[PDB]
Amino acid sequence: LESQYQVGPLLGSGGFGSVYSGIRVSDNLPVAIKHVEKDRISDWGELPNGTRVPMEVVLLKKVSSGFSGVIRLLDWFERPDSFVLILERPEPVQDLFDFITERGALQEELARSFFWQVLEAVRHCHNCGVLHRDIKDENILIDLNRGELKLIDFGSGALLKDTVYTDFDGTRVYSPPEWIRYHRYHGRSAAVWSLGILLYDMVCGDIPFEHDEEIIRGQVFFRQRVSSECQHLIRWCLALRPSDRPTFEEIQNHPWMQDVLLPQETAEIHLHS
Ligand SMILES: CN1CCN(Cc2nc3c(oc4ccc(Br)cc43)c(=O)[nH]2)CC1
Numbered sequence: 001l002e003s004q005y006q007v008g009p010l011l012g013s014g015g016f017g018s019v020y021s022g023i024r025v026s027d028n029l030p031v032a033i034k035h036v037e038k039d040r041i042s043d044w045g046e047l048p049n050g051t052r053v054p055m056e057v058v059l060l061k062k063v064s065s066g067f068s069g070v071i072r073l074l075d076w077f078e079r080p081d082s083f084v085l086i087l088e089r090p091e092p093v094q095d096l097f098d099f100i101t102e103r104g105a106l107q108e109e110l111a112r113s114f115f116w117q118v119l120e121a122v123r124h125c126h127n128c129g130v131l132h133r134d135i136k137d138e139n140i141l142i143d144l145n146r147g148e149l150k151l152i153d154f155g156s157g158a159l160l161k162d163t164v165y166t167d168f169d170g171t172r173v174y175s176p177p178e179w180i181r182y183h184r185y186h187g188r189s190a191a192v193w194s195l196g197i198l199l200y201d202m203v204c205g206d207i208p209f210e211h212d213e214e215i216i217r218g219q220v221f222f223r224q225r226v227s228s229e230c231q232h233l234i235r236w237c238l239a240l241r242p243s244d245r246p247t248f249e250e251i252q253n254h255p256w257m258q259d260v261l262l263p264q265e266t267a268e269i270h271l272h273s
Pocket residue numbers: 011012014016019031032034071087088089090093134138139141152153154155
């Protein structure tokens with residue numbers, strides 16, 4: 001039971017449920033305690049043994065490793081109307097949405113470091129057979145001391161497959177035009193569209209499209225000064241036709257992506273950590 005955890009302040013809540021800061025009583029390890037309401041669970045899965053759990057738990061177990069770029073599931077509990085996930089908690093930490101709110105558009109060197117790290121975290125998820133489906137600033141945490149990003153929140157995710165998805169419940173303004181128009185997308189190229197909306201958001205300080213019509217037209221306007229190489233990569237990730245978008249390898253070989261900072265260097269220069 002959760003006499004093993006001291007519950008601290010609420011960190012956030014939403015369609016999925018609520019999350020609290022917590023501390024594991026035995027060793028004082030910082031954790032986050034996420035309560036997932038059953039009736040809001042968009043997908044269920046089951047365990048190697050074969051217990052009926054949120055898909056989110058299946059996905060988190062598939063990606064669990066010593067790789068710090070994806071959040072680690074430490075433990076979980078079932079309750080009558082909810083599950084309770086116990087997750088790693090970096091400290092001090094700030095999500096990327098709040099970081100951008102506070103700091104505005106990010107210098108390119110900082111955006112390059114963060115974007116590279118996110119691409120390494122997403123490639124790990126895909127190599128583990130997991131499609132995240134809600135990559136966006138609020139689902140990325142920054143371990144401020146170490147300059148390391150972590151992808152969180154597999155609540156909209158699915159097992160990765162090579163055929164079409166026809167369901168989607170992640171964030172609409174990050175979803176690609178083929179979802180908006182046809183309600184169908186493939187995993188990797190929809191991931192890459194969202195990576196293009198994320199990199200825009202980092203270098204311009206806001207997302208590029210609010211309305212369905214803007215998504216489907218796909219015309220990108222730069223509202224801040226951004227280098228032509230960065231603009232070229234963003235407009236490549238946001239190719240209207242799915243098969244026109246780059247693969248991960250093509251993104252990480254892009255001229256804009258070269259000479260990325262190490263995370264510690266990133267913390268020292270940009271995060272004062
Ligand atoms: C769109 N998503 C829905 C869930 N929402 C809450 C959430 N927070 C955390 C989650 O993992 C964490 C690990 C450490 C810390 Br600190 C916070 C979290 C998570 O899965 N959801 C983030 C935004």
